[PDB]
A paper describes a structure:
The pneumococcus acquires Mn2+ via the PsaBCA permease, which comprises the ATP-binding cassette (ABC) transporter, PsaBC, and a cell-surface solute-binding protein (SBP), [name]. Similar to other ABC permeases, the SBP [name] defines the specificity of the uptake pathway. However, our recent studies showed that the functional specificity of the Psa permease in Mn2+ acquisition arose not from the specificity of Mn2+ binding by [name], but instead resulted from the concerted action of protein metal ion coordination chemistry and structural rearrangements that prevented release of other divalent transition metal ions, such as Zn2+, into the permease, despite their ability to bind to PsaA8. [name] uses a ‘spring-hammer’-like mechanism for metal ion binding, in which the dynamics of the metal ion-loaded protein are dictated by a combination of metal ion geometry and the distortion of a helix linking the N- and C-terminal lobes of the protein.
Residue numbers in the entry: 32 to 314
Write the structure that this text describes.
């Protein structure tokens, strides 16, 4: 079997849907954990060295202090675009908004299903190149998976139209919803823009608190892969409840709701619409 390493559970799940049992797949970043800053275990180091194919996010996910993925593949002596591939190649990138983050990409492409499709295309392409005997199989799985993703994408374009302007704002800890906001027509706000920066300072919380206390936003959200303390402080200081845990940088654990890329997205879309519609009744 082809030996394949994926950096996080989101890329791993998409690869599973394309490759099934035809490969030997390993995922580095454990479920629920931050993929921005991770220190690979010796078993991850060993799997990476022996891999014929490595998939990572690219666009500024696994690169920061101090570029853990770069260190891993360099030490394992793997070549970019021969041994390891960014699944984000081709995505319409959104950049970070911060004053000093000039030219720096926002990595969270997958929260737009259109990019999920691109991820899958990239994976299928690379698997096929390395494992021609299974090309037809990979391509068929790609066709089915992308149609499933596409139909959910097309259905969800108007999912937030019903939310009045005053209530219409996604609030999470990390500013991980830029692509989601653009794909499904709903603004987002945050405590900190990206995980590599300081995560939940008094000043950040205060900044978001004063923004919120002059909105009618009915619900806050927290991500499965961050410490919830900052958002809980935001909750107390604004009197806006946290409605639900949502998924950004990881899928859910097996057996939980959202334990794949597709159900993660379905769940996010569902739960976010619920929280912003909170209080709505027929009679």
């Amino acid at each position: 079997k082809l030996k394949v390493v994926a950096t996080n559970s989101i890329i791993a799940d998409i690869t599973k849907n394309i490759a099934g049992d035809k490969i030997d797949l390993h995922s580095i970043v454990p479920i629920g954990q931050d993929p921005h800053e991770y220190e690979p275990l010796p078993e991850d180091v060993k799997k990476t060295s022996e891999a014929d194919l490595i998939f990572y996010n690219g666009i500024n996910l696994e690169t920061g202090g101090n570029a853990w993925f770069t260190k891993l593949v360099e030490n394992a002596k793997k070549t970019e675009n021969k041994d390891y591939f960014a699944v984000s190649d081709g995505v319409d990138v959104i950049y970070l908004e911060g004053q000093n983050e000039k030219g720096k990409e926002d990595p969270h492409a997958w929260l737009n299903l259109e990019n999920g499709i691109i991820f899958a295309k990239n994976i299928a392409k690379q698997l096929s190149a390395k494992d021609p005997n299974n090309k037809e199989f990979y391509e068929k799985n790609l066709k089915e998976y992308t149609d499933k993703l596409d139909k959910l994408d097309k259905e969800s374009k108007d999912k937030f139209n019903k939310i009045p302007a005053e209530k219409k704002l996604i609030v999470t800890s990390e500013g991980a919803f830029k692509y989601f906001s653009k794909a499904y027509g709903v603004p987002s706000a945050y405590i900190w823009e990206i995980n590599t920066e300081e995560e939940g300072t008094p000043e950040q919380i205060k900044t978001l608190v004063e923004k919120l206390r002059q909105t009618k936003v009915p619900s806050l959200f927290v991500e499965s892969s961050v410490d919830d303390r900052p958002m809980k402080t935001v909750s107390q200081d604004t009197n806006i409840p946290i409605y639900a845990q949502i998924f950004t940088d990881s899928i859910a654990e097996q057996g939980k709701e959202g334990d794949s890329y597709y159900s993660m997205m379905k769940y996010n879309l569902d739960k976010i619409a619920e929280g912003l519609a909170k209080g709505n009744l027929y009679f």
